[PDB]
Design a binder for this molecule. Structure first.
Ligand code: HEM
Ligand code: HEM
Ligand code: HEM
Ligand code: HEM
Ligand SMILES: *Cc1ccc(OC)c(OCc2ccccn2)c1
Ligand SMILES: *Cc1ccc(OC)c(OCc2ccccn2)c1
Ligand SMILES: COc1ccc(C)cc1OCc1ccccn1
Ligand SMILES: COc1ccc(C)cc1OCc1ccccn1
Lengths: 146, 141, 141, 146
């Protein structure tokens, strides 16, 4: 994605403050609660019967760290998302068969989590930068069709 | 379609906005304009600079419409018919733009109401904005 | 949201479908399974071969649920609560699949109604199916 | 862009029977009637106030012939739709900013129209083959968005 030098700096600055052990699980848990049909993909994670069970589910939190990890990787290779997410793209498109519209949903839930955690610090321009970032990641994961 | 709990959730969270209506509405629009520039084409004549009084004025109209929709959560087509006339019949706004403004409204609520913006409430608000968007993009008159 | 005219179009068109509704629901399912094979993952226990009696039988059920929706077009959430429970709470069908089935049903009507599948009818039916899809993908208990 | 040798044949055989002067205008007209917001991009076309106005609009009909021509183009270069639609992708994405979900809508509306013209001859396998073509064209047009 084409981030502005200013944007790139603001994005990296905020990300450095993200709790890598919790943010991904919070975003994934919210995806499952806000867009409930997504729970179908994670039925092997156990109890996802209510919002509290989803948010408190150990496997959701553990898996969320891996998802946050992939987002960090994307942040480090904004220049070539397509190639960075090639393996994940094949997984989600061929193995998982997740409709691409869902990738955009997780990216936007992640943005809501950043806003929730950083409050006023997640300014409109900072959000605009992150929106390019997550659209890039979503676009990179949907390339197996694209 | 909203569950009883969704209505409860929505009225409780939005009731917290109160007199912040205008400010939050403006912030949601500004976030949208900046994050998804293609949406500015629906306001070609507006002054969209940061802090614009035009956007601040329009943002209060939008939030108060949401306030009115929350009050009539069980009878939205009738309550928002005038807004449907505007968005579906006159402006012809593409439904995708409603998802963008809805997302910017949720981002704005999350940045300001951390305690209130729980997964459950976030879920109910998202569905509510989707309900609102369906009415404003449908021609039912 | 359907207009009064959409409702008249849906009742009239479904009326024309008449006794062929079951056959059309079965063909819409067959078309979907062939065109978008990932939809088959929702029916692992079904015989899904061309002409399968199980698909013909399930198509009649889908058609009867739609006939019921047409008859309660003014309050579909109430009328389809059991089906919403099944698709949204139990099976968790991704809404994209409802778009696929709605499209396959419109393709089926088009192939069968060269004299009655007018642009207005097509428009009203498409919204009617979007309306049913929303109810079946929403948890509102 | 699959298209088993047999699908490619099926698609080719059906297209030869497609009315070049009208099918494109029926598809565009039905898009304008079924998904009314799409009318926003065609204000210079004239009266689109009622389904009869839309379906009989001479500009819609004239313009649809070009739309159908582009689809013909894609069918004649099924293995390179991205190149075939590059110019149009830039026109629709960067100049008109048409949201990509609408390319999918038009493609499916075109399928409805084919089914409307061919009846029983538009069999589920013939349709499966055309769904690949229309998904391919829409993806090709949304490419600038990649
Ligand atoms: C757009 C951002 C996304 C990113 C960055 C992401 C990242 C990942 C990663 C890192 C893995 C682990 C890969 C591995 O272990 O080899 C994974 C697995 C998985 N993802 Fe995603 N994902 C995305 C979106 C989604 C969405 C939207 C869905 C479903 C609605 C989904 C469903 C899955 C499933 C079910 C697995 C396998 C989990 C398991 O059972 O182990 N992902 N994803
Ligand atoms: C939750 C969804 C929305 C709400 C509740 C909403 C509500 C409103 C209201 C109350 C008006 C003000 C009319 C007045 O001055 O009295 C308005 C006008 C307008 N809206 Fe929306 N709106 C929504 C979404 C959108 C979206 C997504 C767009 C486009 C991207 C849009 C474009 C417009 C424009 C162009 C006007 C007219 C502005 C002008 O020329 O003065 N609206 N809206
Ligand atoms: C207009 C949309 C639809 C309507 C009206 C509808 C209607 C029905 C009805 C009447 C049943 C049977 C309930 C019973 O057994 O009494 C059913 C079951 C089911 N539907 Fe749907 N459905 C729709 C869309 C879909 C879609 C798009 C999917 C997924 C691709 C889906 C997956 C299922 C499954 C998996 C069952 C249970 C089948 C079984 O194992 O017996 N449905 N649906
Ligand atoms: C997926 C199929 C689509 C194809 C193949 C297609 C094809 C075309 C072609 C060939 C042109 C003529 C370009 C020229 O003469 O320079 C064009 C123009 C245009 N298209 Fe499309 N198009 C598609 C979808 C859409 C959709 C979904 C919309 C908007 C809802 C759209 C809106 C327009 C507009 C506004 C123009 C310019 C019209 C004018 O001259 O005023 N197109 N398209
Ligand atoms: C109640 C309701 C109204 C409108 C919808 O879509 C336009 C709708 O879809 C289901 C859903 C939307 C958003 C979040 C979770 N579910 C439901
Ligand atoms: C009445 C209605 C119910 C559900 C919709 O979307 C889920 C909806 O959107 C507007 C629309 C849908 C399909 C064709 C044309 N308009 C309307
Ligand atoms: C105009 O449509 C919408 C407007 C606002 C919102 C919150 C959702 C909408 O659509 C529902 C939706 C969109 C994407 C994924 C799941 N559900
Ligand atoms: C699950 O969602 C849907 C299912 C069937 C239909 C016909 C429309 C749906 O959503 C409305 C829609 C989808 C795409 C474009 C315009 N409108």
């Amino acid at each position: 994605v084409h981030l502005t030098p200013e944007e790139k700096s603001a994005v990296t600055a905020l990300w450095g403050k993200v709790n890598v052990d919790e943010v991904g699980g919070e975003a994934l848990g919210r995806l499952l609660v806000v867009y409930p049909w997504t729970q179908r993909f994670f039925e092997s994670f156990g109890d996802l019967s209510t919002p509290d069970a989803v948010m408190g589910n150990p496997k959701v939190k553990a898996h969320g760290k891996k998802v946050l990890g992939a987002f960090s990787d994307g942040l480090a290779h904004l220049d070539n998302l397509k190639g960075t997410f090639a393996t994940l793209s094949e997984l989600h498109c061929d193995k998982l068969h997740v409709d691409p519209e869902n990738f955009r949903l997780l990216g936007n839930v992640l943005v809501c989590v950043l806003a929730h955690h950083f409050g006023k610090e997640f300014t409109p321009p900072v959000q605009a930068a992150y929106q390019k970032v997550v659209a890039g990641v979503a676009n990179a994961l949907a390339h197996k069709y694209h | 379609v909203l569950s009883p709990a969704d209505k409860t959730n929505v009225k409780a969270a939005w009731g917290k906005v109160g007199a912040h209506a205008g400010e939050y509405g403006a912030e949601a629009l500004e976030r949208m304009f900046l994050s998804f520039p293609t949406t500015k084409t629906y306001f070609p004549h507006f002054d969209l600079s940061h802090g614009s009084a035009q956007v601040k004025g329009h943002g209060k109209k939008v939030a108060d419409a949401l306030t009115n929709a929350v009050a009539h959560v069980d009878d939205m087509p009738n309550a928002l018919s005038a807004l449907s006339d505007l968005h579906a019949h006159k402006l012809r706004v593409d439904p995708v733009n409603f998802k963008l403004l809805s997302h910017c409204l949720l981002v704005t609520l999350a940045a300001h109401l951390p305690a209130e913006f729980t997964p459950a409430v976030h879920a109910s608000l998202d569905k509510f904005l989707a309900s609102v968007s369906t009415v404003l993009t449908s021609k039912y008159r």
